[PDB]
C-alpha cells in the first residue's frame, strides 16, 4: 500500500501538471477555413465581361453611395451628441438640486448586464400560427486536443 497507493497519486499529479501548463489550442472557425471542395476547378463559373454602360452605372452608384453613408454617419453622430449634451446637462441640474441623488445617478448598474436584444423580424409574428412538427439535431463537430 505505501509503495503503490501513494506512488500512484504522485504520478497522476505530475501528468496533470504537464497538461495544465501545456499550451491550449483554439477551436478552429469553419467560416474562415476554405473547404477543399471549393478548390476544385469544376465549380469555377465562366466570367462575363461587363459592358461599358454597366461599369459606368456601378461607378456612379458607388459615388452616390459614399455621400449617402456620410449623411447617415452625420445623423448618427449628431444623435449621440444630442443624447450626450442632454444627459450631461441633466446631471448638472440634478447635482445642484440634490447632491445625494447625483451620486447615485452616476453609479454603475449591476442589473444592466447581461443585456440581450433581438433584431426586428421581416414580418410580425402570426397571431394564430401552427409550425410543423420536427426535431432539431446538432451535428457540430467536436474538436479535442491531443499531445
Amino acid at each position: 500500500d505505501p509503495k503503490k497507493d501513494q506512488e500512484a497519486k504522485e504520478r497522476l499529479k505530475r501528468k496533470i501538471r504537464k497538461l495544465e501548463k501545456a499550451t491550449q489550442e483554439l477551436i478552429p472557425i469553419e467560416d474562415f477555413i476554405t473547404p477543399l471542395k471549393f478548390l476544385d476547378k469544376a465549380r469555377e463559373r465562366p466570367q462575363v465581361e461587363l459592358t461599358f454602360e454597366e461599369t459606368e452605372r456601378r461607378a456612379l452608384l458607388l459615388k452616390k453611395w459614399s455621400l449617402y453613408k456620410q449623411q447617415e454617419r452625420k445623423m448618427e453622430r449628431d444623435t449621440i451628441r444630442a443624447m450626450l449634451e442632454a444627459q450631461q446637462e441633466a446631471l448638472e441640474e440634478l447635482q445642484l438640486e440634490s447632491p445625494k441623488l447625483h451620486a447615485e445617478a452616476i453609479k454603475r448598474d449591476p442589473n444592466l448586464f447581461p443585456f440581450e436584444k433581438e433584431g426586428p423580424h421581416y414580418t410580425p409574428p402570426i397571431p394564430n400560427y401552427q409550425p410543423p412538427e420536427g426535431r432539431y439535431n446538432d451535428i457540430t463537430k467536436v474538436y479535442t486536443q491531443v499531445e
Binding site: 423580424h121 410580425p124 410543423p132
Partner: protein, 66 residues
C-alpha cells in the same frame, strides 16, 4: 436603423453561391438569411422533444381521429 449595416456581401475569395431565403420561425416571424439552395422559404419546426410530456400527448390526440 435596421438598414445601417444590412446591405452586405460575402467577403470571401472562394465561396458557393448563396440564395436569399425567408426563415419562418415558430411564432410565424420571418427573417432574411442566406441558404445553400434557392428554397424560397424555410420553416423552423417546433421541437416535439422540448415539450412537456402531458402536452405531447394532447398534441398527439389532436393528430388522431382524422
Amino acid at each position: 436603423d435596421s438598414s445601417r449595416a444590412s446591405l452586405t456581401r460575402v467577403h470571401r475569395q472562394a465561396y458557393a453561391r448563396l440564395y436569399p431565403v425567408l426563415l419562418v420561425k415558430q411564432d410565424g416571424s420571418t427573417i432574411h438569411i442566406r441558404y445553400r439552395e434557392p428554397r424560397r422559404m424555410l420553416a423552423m419546426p417546433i421541437d416535439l422533444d422540448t415539450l412537456s410530456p402531458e402536452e405531447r400527448r394532447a398534441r398527439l390526440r389532436k393528430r388522431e381521429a382524422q
